[PDB]
Design a protein around this ligand. Structure first.
Ligand SMILES: [Mg+2]
Ligand SMILES: [Mg+2]
Ligand SMILES: [Mg+2]
Ligand SMILES: [Mg+2]
Ligand SMILES: [Mg+2]
Ligand SMILES: [Mg+2]
Ligand SMILES: [Mg+2]
Ligand SMILES: [Mg+2]
Ligand SMILES: [Zn+2]
Lengths: 100, 114, 127, 99, 151, 82, 224, 211
RNA sequence: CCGCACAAGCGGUGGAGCAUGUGGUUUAAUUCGAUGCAACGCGAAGAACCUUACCUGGUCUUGACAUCCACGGAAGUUUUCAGAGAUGAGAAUGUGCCUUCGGGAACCGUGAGACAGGUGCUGCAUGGCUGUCGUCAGCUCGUGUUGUGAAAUGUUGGGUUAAGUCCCGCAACGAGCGCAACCCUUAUCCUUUGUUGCCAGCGGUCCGGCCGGGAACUCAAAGGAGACUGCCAGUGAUAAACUGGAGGAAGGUGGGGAUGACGUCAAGUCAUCAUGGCCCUUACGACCAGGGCUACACACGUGCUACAAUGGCGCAUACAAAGAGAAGCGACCUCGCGAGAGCAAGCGGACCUCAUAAAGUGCGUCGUAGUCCGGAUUGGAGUCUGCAACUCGACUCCAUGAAGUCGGAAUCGCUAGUAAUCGUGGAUCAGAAUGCCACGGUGAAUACGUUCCCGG
């Protein structure tokens, strides 16, 4: 769709990227059983200081081929229309219309 | 019967007579019975006071009947009085647990209107 | 000697073994009345042998897998008949005419798209 | 001492040519094979709306069937393993060699 | 059935009793294939029939049928512009079905606390030309003769 | 109920504003977009405007509200019937 | 054929006096028992003069089409054509068989292709039901065009039995200029037959006489 | 109504895929999208290379592409320098040691793609579509096809409404699975807009799979 | 002449509650589109943020993203200050690499515009695609002949058929798109291969196919071979065809899918995409926070769950299928009333895990009532997910205990493994399934018929 949306998703991804390590350790700490209760406290506080788009939740599985958000084939990440087209000309190897 | 819960439940299987008490549910009924140690299907009839007192005590431990109703009424009164969202909805008689305001909410909505 | 079989059904399959001289029936290391919680199952598994009238002449070692108790018992009766056949081959005709070499293939159908079931159609309010 | 090789494919013809090549290279070095023993091949169904706007009823069903072969050789010589090392295959064939 | 006439798949004799009308019976009373619970309901009731009616409960089945079995039916269509209540006679299998339905619903409507008790109460009634099954048979054997004006 | 192993949740800059209230006391009713942060015993007897989505309504904080969240007092869907 | 040879076979026999055609009066001896009697005095010389033309055509490498669709006489006419290495129509005559020659040629090609394919193979590649269906289609084509698969082109001469029954064939022939030799019963219209033989067309004996004499003279014309 | 795509339905039956590589769920979407990009690049650059088939397999590690076309030495240009820098750009877009291969088809008339593409070219040459498809179908059939069907769609002749047309020739049965029917879709971009074209050729029935 | 067309059945709908859609109504906004068939648990296979196009506010203007030209800087990293953030001001850190040392790439910023940008409008400008008639049996052509010719013939008639299915009569015949069939799938058997699959025979075994062993059987999955009214009689133009039987795992296109001749509907969609015209461009562009997309006088649809003793409850116990999985399934252990938590095996999986089928059955209990029915609804306290569960997530425990005691007219759906029930999984997904695509368990009733309805 709108190129703004596409680039925006790219940015969300790259941003979730370079904070992965800190997010991991902070999840650990705040989840750490028997944390200092302050180390855990100021930990979760500092976590709410990271850029929001470092979470995976802000992301949205987006069609690689089109940028259609809905009908996301998490196996191919394509629009529900595109995966059928790949079957129609025989792009996905070995694929065929099933009949069982 | 003339148990701590003023109500005189059915002279039937203990728990059936117990959950009958307001504020006493199946859990409360069986847990109170566990302390007595009497059978699940013992009727109120054929049971002496020597245990009725005991169960009256075991339910005196918990807050039940009118006292529980007053606590539930308070847990909602002040809630409304704080003007909290669910309190305003309780004032408007609305489902405060986030349900479809559009249709088939007649439970708290009440009767049917055109 | 030994006489085997393979009775199939909607979702069960049962190996079958005839060792003559008896009528006991070991099934998945169980006894029939102990194997099943349903009696008519035992009845319908007796049916073929009851017709051939040879109860305590051959014991059975059998093994059924998959599917539901009825499909089980059906596969059982089938493999029974198959063993009866490969033990007689004169009574192949006897059970064919008895209608026990049927190999029933009655099976569920795939749930087709747009159908609340495999065949049931949605409650389309025509009006 | 065993050498196992899984093969995952999409058509059983190609995988059959591949297994033929495998067992023949095996018997060149006189390897000791346990046979193809085809394994449960996997079937992947997929139904997607074929209509861009407002048509839940219209759907098309596809499926991927990864055919599945396994070879085992209990006495790999060097002249066995060199073959799989110097092995010649197609593209859509998938190999998985292991002890 | 515009070209061929199909009906119901051929029943099989109950292995537990050897008879067959019991099989069609339990199937009419059967729901979703609740076979076990349904044969337990009918066997338990024929047993106490074999006592409350003396022996011949399997024959008391027919003692109920012939007392309640319908002889006439009505089937109206738009052959010329409107309907008419026409009495007509049918082959025995259809009246088998009707009488079985009559004693299947006779038991259910009464309720009698439990299914086994309700079924047992009606089997006797139908066996002895009283009650509701033979009564709804009287309905069809009564309204039919009054509307024998034409066909 | 979010959880108990994590304790309540309140914003960084909201804590800044509340500690400004601490050092200052009764002041200009602070404002936030974050109706999600948790009330704390510090912010008592004061008020704060928070965005209804278009405008920030001032809620005067009291004790019993502590521990609750802000969005339970800042409506965003209005209604006058039909 | 001599008048005595015909008469014993019954060539003089004809249809009822109720059912005759007007142009046949010259060829009719008279009537007996309300039955038309054909005159052999005309029949014999005309048949001989037609045999002369048939011998001539066959002696210049002519292709001859024997035509008759009677259910009784179909095999007789087929065998008659086989006895002189010629082509025949013994089943229902298709409309425009001669005029729509191109369609028949496509049908002839298809019949040849099916028989060649069965000999070559690929029936095993076909499903057994398909192979059986292909055999049935080949049999149907052989039943329809058994006689004219090897005709190659339009014939040089036509021999017709009961010209009234086969009137479409003679109309086609006249439209093509192909000569018509025909056994013409009293009920037929003789305009379409350039060498007309008036005689019985139903009786098996006289039909076989016609066919045998024609085939003997055709083999004679071929031999040279 | 909305008919079945013919090449999709005959795939494997008689039709091979345009990609073969075996992969796994992890290395699949990435894989196929890389393949998309390389295909598309080739399409745009090979607008003149008369590309008919662009198949791409990813062997175990390497990947090879194969192009069936009709500009063989032209696709090669001179010494493959063109296709050589192509090998470079495909290795770089695919991150794989590239393996370019080409094998022309001598019967461009006898595909469904190249013919429709010529048709669209002449469509932007503003030729009359009807005469164009006539030309094409006769060339192909005369050459030895067993049947051709063509179709074009959209405001034909600069129309103010989308007049369609379909034309048949020879024999094209689209319910006999043993048959081979090459099919293709293409487009032309008029000043008035876009016009679809679809092309089928039935070329006799195959016996024994791809073999 | 036809179709679950009616009929005959079977279970519903319409009553209840709840879910779920739509339209109202409201909003600052409740984004757009879908609108009898052929909209309406629609597009969405899954809106807390994101999504979001929408409101409000916050801001930007060659720009979020594209290319080109300079000017500069390695690229980077990490942290502070302010902001609600978007963002502004920084401070540190690195300052490289290929070099023909001149430059260049990666990229970063500034300028400059040449430009970008649009989910702006226009499905009556279109492409592409899909719904429908309808898998209804038709639709046509060549050639022929018929007439001077509009045309006709076939395509007709008599039979017969799932069928323009077939045959015969026959100025028609012959082909083509169809129909059929070749596909997949399923039912019998045979060959091959037998580990992670099998355990018949064997011994051992703590009894666990476990362990030697076994290759049989079961499966596995490649080959196959099969069903043709082939048989027989009954018919019947002796014709097709049909009746019935035999044989047979299977019989009369075995079972099921895939496959939609034409065309029809300016059917639907420019918000998948593509695209003609216009269309704003400091904004109809862009960026951020919050909101809304979840409102409710309502209406209308679609569903779920109930109204009970074939039931409820407790205890005991049997039988499935199909799947999925490595920022994954995750057992095991322990704890926790549970939701869970910790611990951590195993497994990219015929190997580990999910994953421990429900209905069933056995036993006891209830004994018919707004009930031990029903469970909504509110209370309390959690659980878990993610920055974040007010607006609005899922989920446990405690407590409550609405209506409902079978639902007018009207009406739906269904021909066998079907209905109807009982569970299972999958897609999408941090999380969020009564839906949907799937799977097995159980397994019915009814067809006199075509006179009727509907449609062809
Ligand atoms: Mg765009
Ligand atoms: Mg998400
Ligand atoms: Mg719009
Ligand atoms: Mg079809
Ligand atoms: Mg018609
Ligand atoms: Mg926002
Ligand atoms: Mg919505
Ligand atoms: Mg209960
Ligand atoms: Zn005559």
């Amino acid at each position: 769709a709108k190129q703004s949306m596409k680039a925006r998703e790219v940015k969300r991804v790259a941003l979730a990227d370079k904070y992965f390590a800190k997010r991991a350790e902070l999840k650990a700490i705040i989840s750490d059983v028997n944390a200092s209760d302050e180390d855990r406290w100021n930990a979760v506080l500092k976590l709410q200081t990271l850029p929001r788009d470092s979470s995976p939740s802000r992301q949205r599985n987006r069609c690689r081929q089109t940028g259609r958000p809905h009908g996301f084939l998490r196996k191919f990440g394509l629009s529900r229309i595109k995966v059928r087209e790949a079957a129609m000309r025989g792009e996905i190897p070995g694929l065929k219309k099933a009949s069982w | 019967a003339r148990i701590a819960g003023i109500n005189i439940p059915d002279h039937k299987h203990a728990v059936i007579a117990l959950t009958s008490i307001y504020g006493v549910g199946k859990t409360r009924s069986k847990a109170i019975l566990a302390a007595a140690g009497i059978a699940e299907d013992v009727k109120i009839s054929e049971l002496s006071e020597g245990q009725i007192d005991t169960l009256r005590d075991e339910v005196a431990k918990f807050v039940v009947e009118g006292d529980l109703r007053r606590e539930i009424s308070m847990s909602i009164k002040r809630l409304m009085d704080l003007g909290c969202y669910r309190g305003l909805r309780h004032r408007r008689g609305l489902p405060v647990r986030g349900q479809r305001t559009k249709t088939n909410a007649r439970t708290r909505k009440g009767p049917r209107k055109p | 000697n030994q006489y085997y079989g393979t009775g199939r059904r909607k979702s069960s399959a049962a190996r079958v073994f005839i060792k003559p001289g008896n009528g006991k029936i070991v099934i998945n290391q169980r006894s029939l009345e102990q194997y099943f919680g349903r009696e008519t199952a035992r009845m319908v598994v007796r049916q073929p042998l009851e017709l051939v009238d040879m109860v305590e002449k051959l014991d059975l070692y059998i093994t059924v897998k998959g599917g539901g108790i009825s499909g089980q018992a059906g596969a059982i009766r089938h493999g029974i008949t198959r063993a009866l056949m490969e033990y007689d081959e004169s009574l192949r005709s006897e059970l064919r005419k008895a209608g026990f070499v049927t190999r029933d293939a009655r099976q569920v159908e795939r749930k087709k798209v747009g159908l609340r079931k495999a065949r049931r159609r949605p409650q389309f309010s025509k009006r | 001492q065993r050498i196992r090789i899984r093969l995952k494919a999409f058509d059983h013809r190609l995988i059959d040519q591949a297994t033929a090549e495998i067992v023949e290279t095996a018997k060149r070095t006189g390897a000791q094979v346990r046979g193809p023993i085809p394994l449960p091949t996997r079937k992947e169904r997929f139904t997607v709306l074929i209509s861009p706007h407002v048509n839940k009823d219209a759907r098309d069903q596809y499926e991927i069937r990864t055919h599945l072969r396994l070879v085992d050789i209990v006495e790999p010589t060097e002249k066995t393993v060199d073959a799989l090392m110097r092995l010649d295959l197609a593209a859509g064939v998938d190999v998985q060699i292991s002890l | 059935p515009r070209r061929r006439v199909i009906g119901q798949r051929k029943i099989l004799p109950d292995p537990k009793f050897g008879s067959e009308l019991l099989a069609k019976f339990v199937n009419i009373l059967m729901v979703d294939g609740k076979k076990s619970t349904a044969e337990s309901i009918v066997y338990s009731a024929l047993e106490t029939l074999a006592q409350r009616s003396g022996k011949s409960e399997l024959e008391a089945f027919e003692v109920a049928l012939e007392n309640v079995r319908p002889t006439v039916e009505v089937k109206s269509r738009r052959v010329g512009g409107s309907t008419y209540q026409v009495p007509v006679e049918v082959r025995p299998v259809r009246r088998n079905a009707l009488a079985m339905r009559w004693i299947v619903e006779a038991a259910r409507k009464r309720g009698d606390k439990s299914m086994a008790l309700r079924l047992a109460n009606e089997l006797s009634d139908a066996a002895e030309n009283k009650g509701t099954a033979v009564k709804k048979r009287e309905d069809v054997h009564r309204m039919a003769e009054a509307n024998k004006a034409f066909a | 109920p979010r959880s108990l192993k994590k304790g309540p949740f309140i914003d960084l800059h909201l804590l800044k504003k509340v500690e400004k209230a601490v050092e200052s006391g009764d002041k200009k009713p602070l404002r936030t977009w974050s109706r999600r942060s948790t009330i704390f015993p510090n912010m008592i007897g004061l008020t704060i405007a928070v965005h209804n989505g278009r405008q920030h309504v001032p809620v005067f904080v009291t004790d019993e509200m502590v521990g609750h969240k802000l969005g339970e007092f800042a409506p965003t869907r209005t209604y006058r019937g039909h | 054929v001599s008048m005595r040879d015909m008469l014993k076979a019954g060539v003089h026999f004809g249809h009822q006096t109720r059912y005759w055609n007007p142009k046949m009066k010259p060829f009719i001896f008279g009537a007996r028992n309300k039955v038309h009697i054909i005159n052999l005095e005309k029949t014999v010389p005309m048949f001989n003069e037609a045999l002369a033309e048939l011998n001539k055509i066959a002696s210049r490498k002519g292709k001859i089409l024997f035509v008759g669709t009677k259910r009784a006489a179909s095999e007789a006419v087929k065998d008659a054509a086989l006895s002189c290495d010629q082509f025949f129509v013994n089943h229902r005559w298709l409309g425009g068989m001669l005029t729509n020659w191109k369609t028949v040629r496509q049908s002839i090609k298809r019949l040849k292709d099916l028989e060649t394919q069965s000999q070559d193979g690929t029936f095993d590649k076909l499903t057994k039901k398909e192979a059986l269906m292909r055999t049935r289609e080949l049999e149907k084509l052989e039943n329809s065009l058994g006689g004219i698969k090897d005709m190659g082109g339009l014939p040089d001469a036509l021999f017709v039995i009961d010209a009234d029954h086969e009137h479409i064939a003679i109309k086609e022939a006249n439209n093509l200029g192909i000569p018509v030799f025909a056994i013409v019963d009293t009920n037929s219209d003789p305009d379409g037959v350039d060498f007309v033989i008036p005689g019985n067309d139903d009786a098996i004996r006289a039909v076989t006489l016609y066919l045998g004499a024609v085939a003997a003279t055709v083999r004679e014309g071929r031999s040279q | 109504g909305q008919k079945v795509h013919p090449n999709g339905i005959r795939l494997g039956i008689v039709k091979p895929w345009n990609s073969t590589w075996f992969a796994n769920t992890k290395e699949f979407a990435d894989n196929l999208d890389s393949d998309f990009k390389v295909r598309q690049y080739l399409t745009k650059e090979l607008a003149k290379a008369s590309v008919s088939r662009i198949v791409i397999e990813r062997p175990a590690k390497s990947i090879r592409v194969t192009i069936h076309t009709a500009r063989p030495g032209i696709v090669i240009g001179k010494k493959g320098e063109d296709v050589e820098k192509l090998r470079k750009v495909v290795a770089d877009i695919a991150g794989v040691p590239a393996q370019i291969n080409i094998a022309e088809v001598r019967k461009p008339e006898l595909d469904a793609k190249l013919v429709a593409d010529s048709i669209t070219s002449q469509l932007e040459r503003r030729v009359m579509f009807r005469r164009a498809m006539k030309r094409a179908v006769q060339n192909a059939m005369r050459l030895g096809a067993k049947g051709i069907k063509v179709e074009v769609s959209g405001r034909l002749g600069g129309a103010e409404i989308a007049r369609t047309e379909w034309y048949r020739e020879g024999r094209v049965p689209l319910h006999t699975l043993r048959a081979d029917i090459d099919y293709n879709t293409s487009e032309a971009h008029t000043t008035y807009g876009v016009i679809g074209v679809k092309v089928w050729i039935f070329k006799g029935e195959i016996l024994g799979g791809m073999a």
